[PDB]
Amino acid sequence: LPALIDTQATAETRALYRNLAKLRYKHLLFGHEDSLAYGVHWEGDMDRSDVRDVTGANPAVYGWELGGLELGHTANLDAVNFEKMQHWIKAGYSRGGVITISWHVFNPVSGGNSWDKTPAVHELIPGGARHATLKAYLDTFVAFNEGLADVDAQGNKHYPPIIFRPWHEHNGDWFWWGKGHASEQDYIALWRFTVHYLRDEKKLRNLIYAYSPDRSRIDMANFEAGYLYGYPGDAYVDIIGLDNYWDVGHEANTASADEQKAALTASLKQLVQIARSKGKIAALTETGNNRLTIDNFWTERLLGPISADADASEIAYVMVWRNANLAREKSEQFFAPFPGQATADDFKRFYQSEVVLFEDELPPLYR
Template structure:
């Protein structure tokens, strides 16, 4: 039986520490004023990753391979029998005041889906493909040397602050009321400026200097935390693939500005031929995170259209479960299931009902290492089970 209370997790970790094995850690968020639920989530993710890995899916409640905006539906639920433990969401186009994001998801609906996932005990992570502040193009528009213009003193700095204000307004709507009648904001794993070591986004490696990228990250955190009073955010640093610790940390903004050590990998997770690379990256990620009291995670991954019917257990699980170190990531999130009629026919990363990998996905779900939503203890309380 997978389900276990977090108090028992902490007891087990403490026992290991007394026996000279895996030490009990005391990781805390970088925001010293973080809400109680946010601090507890951080502690819970650190505790649970010593035994389990949470499974996540992007846009899981908004649409699927053959449906759009149907209450209660989820391709993951309909194939694995449970919602995912982690829900990924995207805010691209929020900065323009649009009603829908860049993938056609209505923002008001998204707020409700975020609250719904959280109310069932799930973890919420949000990314943001911000549009190019110089050209007005999308995040993939790399013209205009954009980053210096939105730093303090830059010609687009006030506009960028306005974008962050819009983000703050969105988050302020993500307030829920507990059974005791008290309200609190939903804790969010926030993943800005991801895959920055590539050069396909305007904030990428060849588009800005290390100094300017670090300054942008630090300003964003300080503005949201200190000026806007958003104390429900855990910040995720998420480069694309890397082949050394030095490469991963090249643009690291510092321990006071990062909570999650993530990375995105669509490259080394396709077959056994690249599994050694995949394992090596996971080992480096966990080691770097634990050296800095951060939480390691696979923040974005997947195999488009899942052409290998055994990919879930033979490639993804096999890599994560390779050894004691690789198993200590907190979660793995696969990308979205675009609707095959109205969006992109082969752009999906979780199986839908009838997909050839559906049976193997259920095997993946049943493995003791992997947790879906209905396996979860209460990640937002260390005293009671959900």
């Protein structure tokens, strides 16, 4: 029933969206960022995941990250090799998994990373002095996407569908495309150009576009207004996403656990209401508890509050962030368990839930 903004989307892309729309009522796909690239205690294996090591199954949704691609780097900002990334995307897709991609774009003005707040959006949008840079940046993704293609016996080209989730958390002030660094109207212009360029100029047909404000900068008394800050229009968005680490035990959140659980449910309920009104699909596009310090996190803090309300439950998927490699990165950062981690058994319970789907029990999404 929801329809993609790309009226010419590939058969597989159309199928994915249709099937997510169907499965969302009774199920929730689980996702993990950089799941095949490395884990907390390993890197190098070409077919491994912390998630699989714990549960026996890969995540249903695989998140990947392009930051650095635009600069012609061999590897992304977390040292994930782009050729390997292409291999891993193809591998996950071949098994029936879902692919989603974010993009922590480097600051073109300074050469700094996404967290360098030097203003850039005004310069990047149509009419801006650096508009050529925006085109060049997007071109690198066009090229990357080509590296995901196969060609069948009949000479037809096929791609993995990708849930493309750019310019995220734009209601926060931490990225250079965020509030305080870009006007609302300029942000909208940036988004709209991104869609026009990829969908219309470059004729990519394998994208589903995901919009993802951060819950931590939305006033719960006025959720819709906060959510729709910088919203580019229904003609430019397929997935009504949300990044919400806040209500799942963020260290800076002084709300009680019970208040947080209620807020998680309320946030997702309202998200779903917005999606319903717009004929879209909702998803919890980023979440998690860094270092998994909360007892029974998965069942008590994530699944429980989602399942508590039938509106909240209508989200299609939930993705947790990456399991940074300790040896390489020098600190602990992870959002899925690994064997022996305190929440591993509770994660097994989460996996086991009839509601939650990992790769191993996905129906065929692409037909």
